[model samples]
Target: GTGFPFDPHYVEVLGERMHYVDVGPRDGTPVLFLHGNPTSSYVWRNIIPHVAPTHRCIAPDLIGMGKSDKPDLGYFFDDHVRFMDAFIEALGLEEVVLVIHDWGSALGFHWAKRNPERVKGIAFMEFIRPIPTWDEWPEFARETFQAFRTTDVGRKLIIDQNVFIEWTLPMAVARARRKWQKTGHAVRAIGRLSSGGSDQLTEEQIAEFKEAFSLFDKDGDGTITTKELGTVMRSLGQNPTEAELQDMINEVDADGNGTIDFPEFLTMMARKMKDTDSEEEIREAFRVFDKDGNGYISAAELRHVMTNLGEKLTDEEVDEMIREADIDGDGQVNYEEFVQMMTAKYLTEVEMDHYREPFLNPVDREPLWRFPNELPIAGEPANIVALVEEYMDWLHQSPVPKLLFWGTPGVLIPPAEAARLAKSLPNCKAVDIGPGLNLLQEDNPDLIGSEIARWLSTLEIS
Candidate 1:
């Protein structure tokens, strides 16, 4: 019971068919927002209404939740984590920031810890820190919640009753004023018979959500239960226990019946309250992780991320990588991690003396200069493309035959378009010569890629 037309609006996450809320552009800083338990990407509905203009938002529904496929497979933390990694890779997210909550925090933080270089930032709230201190929980909580969290009862709670997933609606929407700020007026009618589970949705929004929801409820089943849980768990390599088995049947057997029916099970699984934190609370974690303010962690910055918590660097490859990226004398990496240091700067004078490359001969290639006519030179201070085109025009008009031109640093001409432009000229070839600031690095890849594509597609190429 999972599919991804995520929002009542255009916002969606088309699992195998659609798996993500892909709003904004490709070059914008990629923010992967994850929801906990029964919540779908729809959790961001009101939130998206605010952030869409400024940034790209990509939220994927967890398996077995929201409008995603909810096969009877029981869900697991590791399974969700694996899905997240695959989601990022499939969408080609490079520099990413994460905003997570509840169960979302577990997968989000763990994933960031594993791939530090790829992580730009992280922020979370109301998380399951899941320390070794459950015994220290509130008296009532330990007596009730802890029994299931730490024992077979807990396993059954998670697997059979959809107890974990059941909190989505209450946690997200139930509060002193309907939990979230914007939806208070709209959500009041959600459970009313006159409204029929409809609230604030426009006709278009209603249609989009209905289509998504229809797909999530596979087999035309009214609710998700152990049957649904079993299918979900199998996807992640797990099976339910006999005790869990009985629990599932009990929850779904709504008519005082010994056996479960589809309607009883599905409605119960989907209609629970969610326990969650607000977006403001969530951003605090992101700011904490972005300690160096380079937007995201460079390879060097990752070492600092790990050691801040006194993590052990046992692997040889990791140790060498740390030494190489620690360019400054700060003993950790920052945005300037890419700047290579001279022996005199960080090493002893004697060490510099032994370096024949620095003292005797250095090969400084004038590669960039050769292609001034074909590329954007760094610090052009004006319309860079025009300057490059002028140079190209001059070269094409020249009597001397030209074979190659080395591109210099400035604005990087889009390779594909540059090839097209260069081909228009006789005896001219564009060659990659030097590095320049990436538009995506300054902003996000999705944003930059979108702007460039739009500009190229609509503007005159000549």
Candidate 2:
């Protein structure tokens, strides 16, 4: 089925003969390939044969899809889990390398985390951890996933319309085709050619990009330097790294000028955009800010966007933002520069979840850091001050480059002192959560969450 060469095998799992492709040596290390929705074991037919020479390659079709037995029950989360668990157990598979994609990736991860000893390793893509609520997603992801999770729209698109297979999967493939078409020249030019030859881009898109790049070369210098690149980076509230600047130059600096000229810069951008999966989304964001359709965002236009966001930035601040990303010292920010600056430090949903705390009504501080006296030790309230002082001396220094000081109005290190302490750090920002002693997180969790989110948005972690 589906152009697969191998004959199907079956194992009786949960009173059903589950279909699978069990090839290669039985004694070899087990490599279990799991396929997601609207697909089956046959999806890995082209991929598994190459690896089967050395390992046991097993590709299984999910319960409702492919050749697998379709039970009458709705294929909910638990149903799939139950069927999959039975399949593995029936096969007596152990020390498995679970290769998964999409929904299967989630299933693989959960299974592996639960049965760590059974799995040797796992490889997956286009997957996410199990998040409790749709509200937990950040701004960009929230809007899309929210729509998909809604009652009417979700059922219409996913169930009645078969959008997952017919619409989403096809759209994703079409987008990839577009990306290759757009970036193939640069990909080949940079000696990273794929098996198939590069495709030629249309004249209109190239000409548009050329016009945009020319506008960014403020002094008509032909080449853009590190300082000029800062404009775009700063505009997106980031501090660009020397490595990133060099990478952009290296992509197209055929003459080894240490800087990227307009033509070279375009190639560089194509290469960079080619490597990213979020190119369309990032491009959409850039287009949104480029109000004039000139493929660049001028300072006035940026200020307008900022003002709409309810931010009243100073002239100097706006200039500083542009200066961070405007490579070639151009007064304006080009689309590539704008996209790079904005998305480079942009945290995905998974990254944001790292900082999010599990909900506890009215908040709980017990799980957080504790005072020295709160440790399991015999100490009276009178001795707490002395012990705390001793602990503070022991915890005198931190190698961290920056810190956020969320201080209360009158309690533990008041606003002024907290600001002073923050300023003392190498690269620090002070955030005052107005008029709260300690328990700032408890009293105003949402405000603190927003403050932290803002602070994180500006950071480039390594």
Candidate 3:
């Protein structure tokens, strides 16, 4: 018997009664919530209420985790993936918005990343950011993860005792709990919030953006130089780091036209607008920043806030970021220009590196690579760059509405690494939830719940 309020529903998944929470209207877009280890569907009990009224909230306790039957199984990453797939298929879920964290983040990402078509939106925390090396990890993290990955020691702490659930879970939540002490603001840490999607642009507003575009387009070529952004920022009486400038525009030639064109401008705008840079909707954004003759008023203020984005990531890391989202360079076209657009993306990043592919064989490793029974060598493709490039070809074009509010990362994923992940997704609405959102369902349920519900409000699920 679960303690959470929602009535439990069980569906036969891979010969087990996979317990789940299916609340809200059947007609509403399905929102699938996933949990990691040492947990149950109970995790989302509070958050569900906020979203259920507006959308279908379906959270499943992985086959071996919750009240679900714990059958004879290895409990490998692949194992959970298999059962989760069965669970989704059994329900005949056609479209889904994912709310995932912890090991659940892995399962959620693997499913949505692979399905692409079935996915609608994604909200994640404490997930993977492909730390190819262990060095980036903090002192505590290196040993903690190292212990879990090793042979006897991993078993010593995890299998022989109930420590992981009894202690580790609390430790993860402790960062938040300690601050709150059953108590909470890392406000500045939760840097700038951006508008993901909002009301359709009005006729007047459309004209306003178009007018501003022309101002930067210069000779009316319907394109603008990346240098133009620097000038715009300068004119706004603000200085910018090279990183900041890159966020707004890629200085390199996107299509031999030697400058970014209309569609590319939209691509950049889409990414920026995903946050709330609309500048007081748009006008105030234009009013506050633009010091040039006319306002640099775009849909949202080009609010480029990088929380603790000071430590520059490795050159290759940023290269990977740009390659995923870059608009193509080959005589660029529109839409499915989408696929090629990503290819051209690398041209900008690589061109700077003299057109070198962001190849770092073993681009990223999977989580359970050391697990004894699973597919060996590496859990992820040897070269993730190639793999994701192929994905960009298949994923939706105009970038989906994604929500990524970070909670804890001093443990595993670095905030910058996760923050940079926005480029990989179409339009990830990323904000740092400070270092507290980990194991959040237990402590900060209200904060996370309201965030999901509010972000969902801005999304067009259809």
lDDT of each: 0.39, 0.50, 0.53
Which stretches of candidate 2 lie above 4 Å from their native place?
130-144, 173-176, 179-462
| Model 2 lDDT per residue over 291-331, tens place | 67898889898786555333466785566566546655678
- lDDT by residue (tens digit), candidate 1, 1-462: 112233432222234423457676546666676765434465444344344555577887665544444433324454555566776777777776665554665567567655656665443333333222433333323344434434356545544443433321222221111101111111111111011221343443343234323322345555434454444333322356656745655644667654445344334323433234222222332333345675543444444433432234444334443343453445443434422211012222342232212112111111111112111222221343343344334434543222221121112233343455457655433433222111111112232223323322332221
TM-score against truth, every candidate? 0.34, 0.38, 0.53
Q: CA lDDT of 34 in candidate 3?
A: 88
Over 4 Å off, model 3:
1-3, 174-398, 408-410
Candidate 3 local lDDT, residue 1: 14
Model 3 worst lDDT run, 10 consecutive residues:
181-190
Error of 1 at 80 (Å): 1.4
Error of 2 at 262 (Å): 34
